[PDB]
Amino acid sequence: GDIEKQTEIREKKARNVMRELKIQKLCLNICVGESGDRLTRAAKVLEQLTGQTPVFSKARYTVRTFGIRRNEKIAVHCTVRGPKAEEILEKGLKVKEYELYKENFSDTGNFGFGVQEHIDLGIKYDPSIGIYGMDFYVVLDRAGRRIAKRRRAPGRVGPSHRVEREESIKWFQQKYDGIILPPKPK
Amino acid sequence: VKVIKNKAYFKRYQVKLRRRREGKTDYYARKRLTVQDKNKYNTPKYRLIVRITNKDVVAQLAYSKIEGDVVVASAYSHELPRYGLKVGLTNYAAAYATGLLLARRHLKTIGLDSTYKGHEELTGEDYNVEEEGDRAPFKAVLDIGLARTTTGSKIFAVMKGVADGGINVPHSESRFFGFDQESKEYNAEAHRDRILGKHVADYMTYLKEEDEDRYKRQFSKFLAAGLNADNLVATYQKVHSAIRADASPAAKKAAKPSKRHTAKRLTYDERKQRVADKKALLLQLKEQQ
Amino acid sequence: AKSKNHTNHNQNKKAHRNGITKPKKHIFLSMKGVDAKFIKNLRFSRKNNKRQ
Amino acid sequence: TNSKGLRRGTRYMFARDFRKHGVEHLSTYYTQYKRGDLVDIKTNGAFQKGMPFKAYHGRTGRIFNVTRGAVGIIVNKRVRGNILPKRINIRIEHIKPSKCRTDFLNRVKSNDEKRKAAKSAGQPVPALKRLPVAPRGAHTVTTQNNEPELLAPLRFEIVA
Amino acid sequence: KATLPLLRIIEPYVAWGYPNNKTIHDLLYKRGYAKVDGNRVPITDNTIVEQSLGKFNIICLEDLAHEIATVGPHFKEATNFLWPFKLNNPTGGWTKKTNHFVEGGDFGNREDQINNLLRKMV
Amino acid sequence: GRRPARCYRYIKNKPYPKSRFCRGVPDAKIRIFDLGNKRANVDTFPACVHMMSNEREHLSSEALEAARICANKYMVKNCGKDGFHLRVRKHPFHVTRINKMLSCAGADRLQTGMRGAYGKPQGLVARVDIGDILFSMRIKEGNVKHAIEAFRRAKFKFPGRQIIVSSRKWGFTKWDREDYERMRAEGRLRSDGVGVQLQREHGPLTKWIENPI
RNA sequence: UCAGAGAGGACGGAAACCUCUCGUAGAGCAAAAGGGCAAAAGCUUGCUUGAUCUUGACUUUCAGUACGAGUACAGACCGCG
RNA sequence: AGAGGAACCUAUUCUCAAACUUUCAAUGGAUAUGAAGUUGCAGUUUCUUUAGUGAACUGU
RNA sequence: GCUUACGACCAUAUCACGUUGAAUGCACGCCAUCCCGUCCGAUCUGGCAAGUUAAGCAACGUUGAGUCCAGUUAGUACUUGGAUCGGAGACGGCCUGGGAAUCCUGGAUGUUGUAAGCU
């Protein structure tokens, strides 16, 4: 009896216009593992790819195995929002052949992948620069996330308004006709 | 994975103050803003609260007590349509007008408006109400809340409006619009233009030249109100003149009857009855499954 | 020949022998240690009040 | 022998109450203090400036000076066979108004008001002295629905 | 309530109780002394009583006895006018003097048995 | 050699547990604390016997283990390993101290007298009070005689006086046998291995349904 | 906003860096221990020299001496905002 | 020490703390309980306040 | 019966899941020329008003956890003062007065001030 009305009202609410999943941001990372010319060239690569200067991340500790010293710049990262983010994500998914694994999506509703060589991203190779691999991470979220991020009177997003793994997977499949490969042999 | 928010966690948890939990009051700054020296005893210390909502500007005068602040005067941008403006009630010009309205209103109320007229010629130059006669000018200290203190902010626009209205608000021109942080120079002409809304008219013209559709999408209700890029400055000047001419608060209406719109809390008997009904239903389902 | 031997045995008895003397009642009249600005203003006020 | 530091042995004395740490509520500063008032001293560990000495914690004193954010207090301290009226400058956060004196002031106000009212109305002067509770007077107790119960001591039982 | 705590404090060293008419009259007549200018003066005449308590309308040993027995408005003056009674040791002796009355001893509140004790002591 | 127990018999000092301040404490002699059919279900052993102390003294780990072995051997030989469940309800946590002194001729040359006489750890003893339960055991009603005889044999290994009694409770649980039976028949007591848990009323009816009480 | 946990991402692994959730302080605050601290007293950063000149009062030890340390003011000239 | 999902999680369980504690006595410490007080009126101040606004003082 | 600004007490106010939300309002929201700040108009800042109660927020629901109050524990534990009191002692009771706290049980789930507004 009342279950039918409850279910139909829930579906109608879910069909609200403010609940659309959208690409909140795309984060590009390159951990070169050391400082100097290689790091500078990786920063050059990222600048070429996105169009905005990246930021250098420094080591937090010292590890002899990694040859890494504390406070040394070892990574270059950037964050892109909007149509440029969509274009770069499309290029990355073309490189990955629009194929992803079930385990690549996080329980919160984001997902990432990596490219071994940035030449595959439609960037002309430069002998001076070289070849760099990089990490793509797409963070999706609906409108209204500003509640949790604004300075004045932050709140917490409602459970129904939060995103989930299978919803992110459906978004990926529908937008990009993405393929979900079988889990990798453990 | 070990559960973090467990019984012991909740037993030991201490909740912050209500307004800090609500993220609405900064108590560190409040203590310094509101506490009066003990050798001045119960003499009120006056604070000019400035707040900007998504659609309105709120300016208030208050002083603190053990059982809550005492607001003595207030002025809102949504109250400007009585002095003209129907739209753009949040921009720099609206903020300055609201501040001026608050200042004139409270000076009228406490009977000092005739003695202190403030700066009646908009020029954008820094103005500090100078003491006249024996009665010193009314004094208030600015309270911005959680707003960021950037150069040319509308909170400082409201503060400038109040100071021009003629209330002694200690301040410096550093964070007014037209102050160059690099060269530390103050452009009174630029500040006056921003107060009069020339930036809004410039944006109107820019969008009109660029694209008609975007211009309409951006200034839809401005056009409906009949405000274009050649009338806004005069409109703001007229608004200032009207505010200075009259500043008494609007009259109050009658109290309409009220009816419950929300659910009322169940009683003890109702709750126990619901418990019994759920118990019976669950037993029925268990038997039938 | 240890000779430290601290104690508080008979001290309360000695103190109460002559009674415990409570503070006088004029100690609250002096303005010693009061704010200099307030004392200055008080001096000015007292200097000027007309006797009749 | 013990060390003679300022805060020796104040581990629990200067600590905050359980689930009571953090920001200090502002009625503490809004409270009005005037010279001649009585105040209790209770150190607030969260404010390391203007702290009273441990020997004055929990003691009541009289204000003799009111500065910007502190007060001078005269507190009695026992030193051998004399009680010294020591003067201490304590900040507001370590201070709380004393209620004994305000209760006495209320009683005096009520006494004066009753006397004035009776005199104006022509009544005799009423009694305005606190009296020790007198022994209970004579009365009668009824057993209706309250019949006495016979009580006897109980036997010992091995409660394993 | 302002005197019972004192009795509890001094329980081990005193025997006290509720005096009766005969006890009060015997105490006042046989062992009555007045504090007159700091001097212990035997009360052999009603004029001695009247000189000190005449202001409060107590003029005779009977008036003093009534004041004491009924706890009149001038009980304080009436009693403080009397020198502390200096009683004789009871004829028959004590019992323990180191245990409460309920323990079969002597100290503490013996209620109306103080009259029995005073019939020997006085 | 170990000092006589009479030296550390009575409780005189404050508790001295092994902690960061007291280091180099030798391991206590008694390690095992639950013997017999310890993994028994709650209903296997409804009868229960306690062995209380009548002295405020120190029960050495040595004495505790001696009594443990004595009772365990007696019960293993008389009733089988799986017929009882014995629980030593007292853990040695108090540390005693010894101020060692040389006992040879001419020792006075190197002896330090009473100067700086603070001792070093010697052993672990269990502080006991009047009414404290030293040993407890749960068995079948047909083995109470063996229980009492075992506790009798064991008590002579402890200093002072001990009293052997039979408890009205259901085994080691906290309910008298009649109330335990009634509550279990009702469904208010859920098995907790050796013991049981009370299933209180309040809470969500969703978990209520899993066991309607 | 910390310690830490969970879940994701080329080389990258238990451990490099990036991302999102949770996180009452379980971190950090030069040092011993104990108090205190969450739009801070912690981290990042801008500007600075109040770690300056001057006299009294007071607390601590206490004989109510001194030194040392500290507290609340008063006068001057400044720093940040 | 087992119980329900080798470790792990959950709910339990036996026994403890001079340098553990949510809670917390009895004894104990301190302050106040009027004339050096309470109400008003009528003056002073260069202190304080936008302001007789306060604070304090003064008065045969 | 509610909304906002500023508050007082600082969980009876917190936390989890869910239902509802009239009007004002708050909020999300659109844009980024200008002021302003960022790797990034995400935050901050500025100009706006197409759209939404989806979230925040408010009210309500839960034999909800927590918190708070009360009962019970119990005249119990402990304790002031007394004894040429019992006992080898450890300790124990009696006389004289104070007098708790867990488990467990039941109930409550913010109150309120100034100013402005809706109904």
PDB file of N, CA, C and O (backbone and C1' of nucleotides) in Angstrom, chain A residues 25 29 31 33 57 60 66 75 103-104 107-108 110 113 133 135 137 139 145 156, chain G residues 3-4 6-13 15-23 39:
ATOM      1  N   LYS A  25      36.349  18.058 -10.318  1.00  0.00           N
ATOM      2  CA  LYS A  25      37.694  18.462 -10.707  1.00  0.00           C
ATOM      3  C   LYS A  25      38.485  17.273 -11.229  1.00  0.00           C
ATOM      4  O   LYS A  25      38.117  16.112 -11.029  1.00  0.00           O
ATOM      5  N   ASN A  29      48.888  14.332 -11.402  1.00  0.00           N
ATOM      6  CA  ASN A  29      50.048  14.186 -10.533  1.00  0.00           C
ATOM      7  C   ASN A  29      51.202  13.556 -11.297  1.00  0.00           C
ATOM      8  O   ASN A  29      50.994  12.672 -12.130  1.00  0.00           O
ATOM      9  N   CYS A  31      54.886  12.173  -9.821  1.00  0.00           N
ATOM     10  CA  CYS A  31      55.903  11.989  -8.787  1.00  0.00           C
ATOM     11  C   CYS A  31      57.180  11.532  -9.478  1.00  0.00           C
ATOM     12  O   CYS A  31      57.326  10.367  -9.852  1.00  0.00           O
ATOM     13  N   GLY A  33      60.132  11.573  -8.115  1.00  0.00           N
ATOM     14  CA  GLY A  33      60.967  10.912  -7.136  1.00  0.00           C
ATOM     15  C   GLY A  33      62.286  11.596  -6.855  1.00  0.00           C
ATOM     16  O   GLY A  33      63.080  11.065  -6.071  1.00  0.00           O
ATOM     17  N   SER A  57      55.307  19.534  -4.859  1.00  0.00           N
ATOM     18  CA  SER A  57      55.115  18.898  -3.565  1.00  0.00           C
ATOM     19  C   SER A  57      56.436  18.296  -3.110  1.00  0.00           C
ATOM     20  O   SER A  57      57.103  17.586  -3.879  1.00  0.00           O
ATOM     21  N   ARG A  60      57.969  14.444   2.684  1.00  0.00           N
ATOM     22  CA  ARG A  60      57.616  14.631   4.085  1.00  0.00           C
ATOM     23  C   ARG A  60      58.599  13.965   5.036  1.00  0.00           C
ATOM     24  O   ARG A  60      58.611  14.291   6.228  1.00  0.00           O
ATOM     25  N   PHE A  66      64.295   4.896  -1.197  1.00  0.00           N
ATOM     26  CA  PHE A  66      63.790   5.704  -2.295  1.00  0.00           C
ATOM     27  C   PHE A  66      64.758   6.797  -2.719  1.00  0.00           C
ATOM     28  O   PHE A  66      64.461   7.531  -3.667  1.00  0.00           O
ATOM     29  N   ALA A  75      57.451  15.987  -6.401  1.00  0.00           N
ATOM     30  CA  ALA A  75      56.259  15.822  -7.220  1.00  0.00           C
ATOM     31  C   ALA A  75      55.815  17.161  -7.787  1.00  0.00           C
ATOM     32  O   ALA A  75      56.125  18.221  -7.247  1.00  0.00           O
ATOM     33  N   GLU A 103      37.606  -2.015  -9.601  1.00  0.00           N
ATOM     34  CA  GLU A 103      38.314  -1.574  -8.407  1.00  0.00           C
ATOM     35  C   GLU A 103      38.920  -0.183  -8.543  1.00  0.00           C
ATOM     36  O   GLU A 103      39.480   0.327  -7.568  1.00  0.00           O
ATOM     37  N   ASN A 104      38.828   0.441  -9.716  1.00  0.00           N
ATOM     38  CA  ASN A 104      39.381   1.772  -9.918  1.00  0.00           C
ATOM     39  C   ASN A 104      38.505   2.873  -9.338  1.00  0.00           C
ATOM     40  O   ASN A 104      38.961   4.017  -9.240  1.00  0.00           O
ATOM     41  N   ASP A 107      34.889   4.161  -2.974  1.00  0.00           N
ATOM     42  CA  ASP A 107      33.572   4.018  -2.365  1.00  0.00           C
ATOM     43  C   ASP A 107      32.865   5.355  -2.198  1.00  0.00           C
ATOM     44  O   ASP A 107      31.653   5.375  -1.957  1.00  0.00           O
ATOM     45  N   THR A 108      33.585   6.467  -2.316  1.00  0.00           N
ATOM     46  CA  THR A 108      32.993   7.788  -2.167  1.00  0.00           C
ATOM     47  C   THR A 108      32.410   8.323  -3.470  1.00  0.00           C
ATOM     48  O   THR A 108      31.503   9.160  -3.426  1.00  0.00           O
ATOM     49  N   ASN A 110      34.649   8.836  -6.570  1.00  0.00           N
ATOM     50  CA  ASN A 110      35.680   9.340  -7.463  1.00  0.00           C
ATOM     51  C   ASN A 110      36.374   8.164  -8.132  1.00  0.00           C
ATOM     52  O   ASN A 110      36.162   7.009  -7.757  1.00  0.00           O
ATOM     53  N   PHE A 113      43.102   6.840 -12.795  1.00  0.00           N
ATOM     54  CA  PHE A 113      43.885   5.925 -13.613  1.00  0.00           C
ATOM     55  C   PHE A 113      45.252   6.562 -13.835  1.00  0.00           C
ATOM     56  O   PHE A 113      45.576   7.595 -13.240  1.00  0.00           O
ATOM     57  N   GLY A 133      55.184   9.753 -17.365  1.00  0.00           N
ATOM     58  CA  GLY A 133      53.892   9.192 -17.026  1.00  0.00           C
ATOM     59  C   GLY A 133      53.205  10.059 -15.994  1.00  0.00           C
ATOM     60  O   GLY A 133      53.856  10.889 -15.354  1.00  0.00           O
ATOM     61  N   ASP A 135      49.381  10.607 -13.303  1.00  0.00           N
ATOM     62  CA  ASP A 135      48.222  10.073 -12.605  1.00  0.00           C
ATOM     63  C   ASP A 135      47.040  11.013 -12.790  1.00  0.00           C
ATOM     64  O   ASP A 135      47.146  12.210 -12.498  1.00  0.00           O
ATOM     65  N   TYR A 137      43.136  11.759 -11.607  1.00  0.00           N
ATOM     66  CA  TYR A 137      42.096  11.473 -10.629  1.00  0.00           C
ATOM     67  C   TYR A 137      40.923  12.419 -10.827  1.00  0.00           C
ATOM     68  O   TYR A 137      41.056  13.632 -10.660  1.00  0.00           O
ATOM     69  N   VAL A 139      37.389  13.695  -9.574  1.00  0.00           N
ATOM     70  CA  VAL A 139      36.527  13.831  -8.408  1.00  0.00           C
ATOM     71  C   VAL A 139      35.189  14.364  -8.897  1.00  0.00           C
ATOM     72  O   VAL A 139      35.110  15.496  -9.398  1.00  0.00           O
ATOM     73  N   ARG A 145      27.918  20.914  -2.835  1.00  0.00           N
ATOM     74  CA  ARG A 145      29.075  20.541  -2.031  1.00  0.00           C
ATOM     75  C   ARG A 145      29.677  21.742  -1.318  1.00  0.00           C
ATOM     76  O   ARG A 145      30.455  21.564  -0.375  1.00  0.00           O
ATOM     77  N   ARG A 156      27.265  19.151   6.761  1.00  0.00           N
ATOM     78  CA  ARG A 156      27.633  17.872   6.169  1.00  0.00           C
ATOM     79  C   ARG A 156      26.560  17.466   5.172  1.00  0.00           C
ATOM     80  O   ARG A 156      25.364  17.619   5.441  1.00  0.00           O
TER      81      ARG A 156
ATOM     82  P     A G   3      49.029  15.185  11.063  1.00  0.00           P
ATOM     83  O5'   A G   3      48.943  14.176  12.290  1.00  0.00           O
ATOM     84  C5'   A G   3      50.009  14.071  13.220  1.00  0.00           C
ATOM     85  C4'   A G   3      49.748  12.998  14.246  1.00  0.00           C
ATOM     86  C3'   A G   3      49.364  11.632  13.702  1.00  0.00           C
ATOM     87  O3'   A G   3      50.479  10.874  13.271  1.00  0.00           O
ATOM     88  C1'   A G   3      47.885  12.223  15.441  1.00  0.00           C
ATOM     89  P     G G   4      50.432  10.097  11.866  1.00  0.00           P
ATOM     90  O5'   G G   4      49.189   9.113  12.011  1.00  0.00           O
ATOM     91  C5'   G G   4      49.145   8.149  13.051  1.00  0.00           C
ATOM     92  C4'   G G   4      47.748   7.625  13.270  1.00  0.00           C
ATOM     93  C3'   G G   4      47.094   6.940  12.084  1.00  0.00           C
ATOM     94  O3'   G G   4      47.529   5.605  11.900  1.00  0.00           O
ATOM     95  C1'   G G   4      45.566   8.453  13.047  1.00  0.00           C
ATOM     96  P     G G   6      43.601   1.519   7.759  1.00  0.00           P
ATOM     97  O5'   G G   6      42.242   1.818   6.988  1.00  0.00           O
ATOM     98  C5'   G G   6      41.010   1.295   7.461  1.00  0.00           C
ATOM     99  C4'   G G   6      39.846   1.802   6.650  1.00  0.00           C
ATOM    100  C3'   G G   6      40.020   1.755   5.143  1.00  0.00           C
ATOM    101  O3'   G G   6      39.788   0.466   4.605  1.00  0.00           O
ATOM    102  C1'   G G   6      39.156   3.863   5.768  1.00  0.00           C
ATOM    103  P     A G   7      40.625  -0.041   3.333  1.00  0.00           P
ATOM    104  O5'   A G   7      39.989   0.772   2.124  1.00  0.00           O
ATOM    105  C5'   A G   7      38.586   0.782   1.919  1.00  0.00           C
ATOM    106  C4'   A G   7      38.198   1.777   0.859  1.00  0.00           C
ATOM    107  C3'   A G   7      39.071   1.777  -0.382  1.00  0.00           C
ATOM    108  O3'   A G   7      38.728   0.739  -1.281  1.00  0.00           O
ATOM    109  C1'   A G   7      38.719   4.003   0.342  1.00  0.00           C
ATOM    110  P     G G   8      39.782   0.251  -2.386  1.00  0.00           P
ATOM    111  O5'   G G   8      39.579   1.293  -3.568  1.00  0.00           O
ATOM    112  C5'   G G   8      40.642   1.601  -4.451  1.00  0.00           C
ATOM    113  C4'   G G   8      40.435   2.934  -5.117  1.00  0.00           C
ATOM    114  C3'   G G   8      41.593   3.419  -5.968  1.00  0.00           C
ATOM    115  O3'   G G   8      41.603   2.832  -7.255  1.00  0.00           O
ATOM    116  C1'   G G   8      40.892   5.162  -4.549  1.00  0.00           C
ATOM    117  P     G G   9      42.861   1.957  -7.731  1.00  0.00           P
ATOM    118  O5'   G G   9      43.781   3.015  -8.478  1.00  0.00           O
ATOM    119  C5'   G G   9      43.225   3.889  -9.445  1.00  0.00           C
ATOM    120  C4'   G G   9      44.082   5.109  -9.648  1.00  0.00           C
ATOM    121  C3'   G G   9      45.561   4.859  -9.870  1.00  0.00           C
ATOM    122  O3'   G G   9      45.854   4.450 -11.193  1.00  0.00           O
ATOM    123  C1'   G G   9      45.280   6.625  -8.329  1.00  0.00           C
ATOM    124  P     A G  10      46.572   3.039 -11.458  1.00  0.00           P
ATOM    125  O5'   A G  10      48.117   3.359 -11.256  1.00  0.00           O
ATOM    126  C5'   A G  10      48.739   4.399 -11.991  1.00  0.00           C
ATOM    127  C4'   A G  10      49.797   3.859 -12.918  1.00  0.00           C
ATOM    128  C3'   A G  10      51.063   3.346 -12.252  1.00  0.00           C
ATOM    129  O3'   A G  10      50.922   2.010 -11.804  1.00  0.00           O
ATOM    130  C1'   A G  10      51.615   4.731 -14.104  1.00  0.00           C
ATOM    131  P     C G  11      51.794   1.465 -10.573  1.00  0.00           P
ATOM    132  O5'   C G  11      53.299   1.605 -11.073  1.00  0.00           O
ATOM    133  C5'   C G  11      53.828   0.749 -12.075  1.00  0.00           C
ATOM    134  C4'   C G  11      55.256   1.108 -12.397  1.00  0.00           C
ATOM    135  C3'   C G  11      56.187   1.203 -11.199  1.00  0.00           C
ATOM    136  O3'   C G  11      56.701  -0.059 -10.818  1.00  0.00           O
ATOM    137  C1'   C G  11      56.455   3.118 -12.567  1.00  0.00           C
ATOM    138  P     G G  12      57.213  -0.305  -9.318  1.00  0.00           P
ATOM    139  O5'   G G  12      56.054   0.301  -8.411  1.00  0.00           O
ATOM    140  C5'   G G  12      56.105   0.164  -6.998  1.00  0.00           C
ATOM    141  C4'   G G  12      55.089   1.036  -6.303  1.00  0.00           C
ATOM    142  C3'   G G  12      53.821   1.336  -7.108  1.00  0.00           C
ATOM    143  O3'   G G  12      52.690   1.392  -6.238  1.00  0.00           O
ATOM    144  C1'   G G  12      54.855   3.355  -6.493  1.00  0.00           C
ATOM    145  P     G G  13      52.192   0.081  -5.453  1.00  0.00           P
ATOM    146  O5'   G G  13      53.079   0.077  -4.130  1.00  0.00           O
ATOM    147  C5'   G G  13      52.741  -0.738  -3.014  1.00  0.00           C
ATOM    148  C4'   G G  13      53.654  -1.933  -2.905  1.00  0.00           C
ATOM    149  C3'   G G  13      54.279  -2.162  -1.528  1.00  0.00           C
ATOM    150  O3'   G G  13      54.373  -3.560  -1.262  1.00  0.00           O
ATOM    151  C1'   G G  13      55.986  -1.913  -3.139  1.00  0.00           C
ATOM    152  P     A G  15      51.570   0.767   2.375  1.00  0.00           P
ATOM    153  O5'   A G  15      52.995   1.347   1.973  1.00  0.00           O
ATOM    154  C5'   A G  15      53.228   2.746   1.955  1.00  0.00           C
ATOM    155  C4'   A G  15      54.345   3.131   2.892  1.00  0.00           C
ATOM    156  C3'   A G  15      55.290   4.206   2.379  1.00  0.00           C
ATOM    157  O3'   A G  15      54.785   5.515   2.582  1.00  0.00           O
ATOM    158  C1'   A G  15      56.543   2.396   3.250  1.00  0.00           C
ATOM    159  P     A G  16      54.025   6.294   1.398  1.00  0.00           P
ATOM    160  O5'   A G  16      54.913   7.594   1.174  1.00  0.00           O
ATOM    161  C5'   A G  16      56.284   7.481   0.815  1.00  0.00           C
ATOM    162  C4'   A G  16      56.810   8.746   0.185  1.00  0.00           C
ATOM    163  C3'   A G  16      55.799   9.523  -0.650  1.00  0.00           C
ATOM    164  O3'   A G  16      56.090  10.918  -0.586  1.00  0.00           O
ATOM    165  C1'   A G  16      57.563   8.771  -2.042  1.00  0.00           C
ATOM    166  P     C G  17      55.326  11.860   0.469  1.00  0.00           P
ATOM    167  O5'   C G  17      54.347  12.732  -0.433  1.00  0.00           O
ATOM    168  C5'   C G  17      54.860  13.722  -1.311  1.00  0.00           C
ATOM    169  C4'   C G  17      54.258  13.605  -2.688  1.00  0.00           C
ATOM    170  C3'   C G  17      52.761  13.845  -2.784  1.00  0.00           C
ATOM    171  O3'   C G  17      52.427  15.221  -2.812  1.00  0.00           O
ATOM    172  C1'   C G  17      53.317  11.885  -3.977  1.00  0.00           C
ATOM    173  P     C G  18      51.113  15.753  -2.056  1.00  0.00           P
ATOM    174  O5'   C G  18      49.930  15.385  -3.051  1.00  0.00           O
ATOM    175  C5'   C G  18      49.931  15.871  -4.384  1.00  0.00           C
ATOM    176  C4'   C G  18      48.852  15.219  -5.206  1.00  0.00           C
ATOM    177  C3'   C G  18      47.463  15.219  -4.594  1.00  0.00           C
ATOM    178  O3'   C G  18      46.791  16.456  -4.739  1.00  0.00           O
ATOM    179  C1'   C G  18      47.948  13.068  -5.425  1.00  0.00           C
ATOM    180  P     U G  19      45.807  16.972  -3.579  1.00  0.00           P
ATOM    181  O5'   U G  19      44.549  16.008  -3.699  1.00  0.00           O
ATOM    182  C5'   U G  19      43.871  15.869  -4.936  1.00  0.00           C
ATOM    183  C4'   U G  19      42.734  14.885  -4.846  1.00  0.00           C
ATOM    184  C3'   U G  19      41.867  14.970  -3.606  1.00  0.00           C
ATOM    185  O3'   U G  19      40.945  16.045  -3.640  1.00  0.00           O
ATOM    186  C1'   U G  19      42.348  12.707  -4.086  1.00  0.00           C
ATOM    187  P     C G  20      40.414  16.694  -2.270  1.00  0.00           P
ATOM    188  O5'   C G  20      39.281  15.687  -1.788  1.00  0.00           O
ATOM    189  C5'   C G  20      38.241  15.291  -2.668  1.00  0.00           C
ATOM    190  C4'   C G  20      37.435  14.156  -2.092  1.00  0.00           C
ATOM    191  C3'   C G  20      36.995  14.329  -0.651  1.00  0.00           C
ATOM    192  O3'   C G  20      35.838  15.135  -0.532  1.00  0.00           O
ATOM    193  C1'   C G  20      37.854  12.140  -0.975  1.00  0.00           C
ATOM    194  P     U G  21      35.227  15.456   0.916  1.00  0.00           P
ATOM    195  O5'   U G  21      34.670  14.054   1.422  1.00  0.00           O
ATOM    196  C5'   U G  21      34.050  13.954   2.693  1.00  0.00           C
ATOM    197  C4'   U G  21      34.011  12.538   3.207  1.00  0.00           C
ATOM    198  C3'   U G  21      34.162  12.397   4.710  1.00  0.00           C
ATOM    199  O3'   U G  21      32.966  12.683   5.410  1.00  0.00           O
ATOM    200  C1'   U G  21      35.545  10.818   3.632  1.00  0.00           C
ATOM    201  P     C G  22      32.968  13.789   6.573  1.00  0.00           P
ATOM    202  O5'   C G  22      33.478  12.983   7.845  1.00  0.00           O
ATOM    203  C5'   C G  22      32.821  11.792   8.241  1.00  0.00           C
ATOM    204  C4'   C G  22      33.713  10.903   9.065  1.00  0.00           C
ATOM    205  C3'   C G  22      34.390  11.544  10.261  1.00  0.00           C
ATOM    206  O3'   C G  22      33.525  11.734  11.365  1.00  0.00           O
ATOM    207  C1'   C G  22      35.938  10.185   9.111  1.00  0.00           C
ATOM    208  P     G G  23      33.632  13.075  12.243  1.00  0.00           P
ATOM    209  O5'   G G  23      35.047  12.952  12.963  1.00  0.00           O
ATOM    210  C5'   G G  23      35.345  11.843  13.796  1.00  0.00           C
ATOM    211  C4'   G G  23      36.827  11.712  14.042  1.00  0.00           C
ATOM    212  C3'   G G  23      37.508  12.918  14.665  1.00  0.00           C
ATOM    213  O3'   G G  23      37.330  12.989  16.066  1.00  0.00           O
ATOM    214  C1'   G G  23      38.786  12.163  12.836  1.00  0.00           C
ATOM    215  P     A G  39      38.457  27.087  17.320  1.00  0.00           P
ATOM    216  O5'   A G  39      38.855  27.543  15.848  1.00  0.00           O
ATOM    217  C5'   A G  39      40.211  27.757  15.485  1.00  0.00           C
ATOM    218  C4'   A G  39      40.317  28.722  14.332  1.00  0.00           C
ATOM    219  C3'   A G  39      40.326  30.197  14.705  1.00  0.00           C
ATOM    220  O3'   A G  39      41.622  30.660  15.039  1.00  0.00           O
ATOM    221  C1'   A G  39      38.732  29.825  13.000  1.00  0.00           C
TER     222        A G  39
END
